[PDB]
From a paper:
Protocols for the microcrystallization of ADC were developed in-house and are fully described in Section 2. The two different proteins microcrystallize from significantly different precipitant mixtures: PEG 6000 with NaCl for lysozyme and ammonium sulfate for ADC. Seven ADC data sets were collected at distances varying between 0 and 6 mm from the flow-focusing cross. At a constant 10:1 flow-focusing ratio between the buffer and the crystalline slurry and at a total flow rate of 550 µl h−1, this 6 mm distance is equivalent to 2.14 s of sample-travel time from the start of the flow-focusing region. The overall indexable hit rate for all ADC data sets was very high, varying between 13 and 40% of all X-ray ‘on’ images. Two final experiments were run to further elucidate the performance of these devices. Firstly, a further ADC data set was collected 3 mm downstream of the flow-focusing region [position E in Fig. 3(b)] at a buffer:sample flow-focusing ratio of 5:1, with a correlated decrease in the overall flow rate to 300 µl h−1 (compared with the previous 10:1 ratio and 550 µl h−1). The indexable hit rate did not increase under these conditions, showing that the number of hits is mostly defined by the sample concentration rather than the flow-focusing ratio or the speed of the sample inside the chip (up to 5 mm s−1). The overall X-ray dose (diffraction-weighted) was calculated with RADDOSE3D to be 74 kGy for ADC and 55 kGy for lysozyme. As expected, there was no evidence of radiation damage to the proteins during this room-temperature data collection, with both proteins showing intact disulfide bonds and carboxylate-containing side chains.
An affordable 3D-printed, X-ray-compatible microfluidic device (3D-MiXD) is reported that allows data to be collected from protein microcrystals in a 3D flow with very high hit and indexing rates, while keeping the sample consumption low. By designing a microfluidic chip capable of centering protein microcrystals in a stable 3D liquid flow, serial synchrotron crystallographic data sets could be collected with low sample consumptions and fast collection times.
Author numbering:
A (entry chain D): 0 to 24
B (entry chain E): 25 to 115
C (entry chain A): -1 to 24
D (entry chain B): 25 to 123
Write the structure that this text describes.
């Protein structure tokens, strides 16, 4: 009856490789 | 949005179109978006659209997904964690 | 199947704001 | 709050009184509110109340709704996406758009 919010998964300390303000999808 | 190498998505159990949290270790910003698949083996993490205002190329980030389940199942639940170093090389 | 995901249902991509009203009543 | 042309709500599958996220491409602000229906064919996007501190006339935004469902349904789910150009002219596809 009581529903919890739990961590499902994580990517630990990845680096951003690209950043695009103008994307269309 | 954030386009992620499909091998990374598979290792962490994150789905295409799922809600994700991004926590930026470099600048401290925290935001919520959704996941898009990038080509396998590309090692891409791309921040698209409005999210490009919260992260720059070279920032270190943590990407997380959350699910809901009954308390009895939550007590023994084990998350999927993937660890990275260097140029997005998975350990 | 009891593990529940949060998924993108839908989106309006790059719509332009046409009106902004601080003092709205509704 | 945010009042949206009912045609746009129908194309994205968003309901009146549903929680929505607004991501402002122009100024980078990110906030949550709820959807109100404006008249069909009006092409209105109106930010009302406290939300008027986070967007201005002419800003470009992304409006999203999120639902919950079990893992097996999530793996074959496809979202409802509408794309816009010009005077809030709606297209089904990203092909026609300049940018």
């Amino acid at each position: 009856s009581m529903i919890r919010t739990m961590l499902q998964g994580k990517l630990h300390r990845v680096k951003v490789t690209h950043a695009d303000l103008h994307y269309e999808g | 949005x954030c386009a992620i190498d499909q091998d990374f998505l598979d290792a962490a159990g994150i789905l295409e179109n799922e809600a994700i949290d991004i926590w930026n270790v470099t600048n401290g910003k925290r935001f919520s978006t959704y996941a898009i698949a990038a080509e396998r083996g590309s090692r891409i993490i791309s921040v698209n659209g409005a999210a490009a205002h919260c992260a720059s190329v070279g920032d270190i980030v943590i990407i997380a997904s959350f699910v809901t389940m009954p308390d009895e199942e939550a007590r023994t639940w084990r998350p999927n964690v993937a660890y990275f170093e260097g140029d997005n090389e998975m350990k």
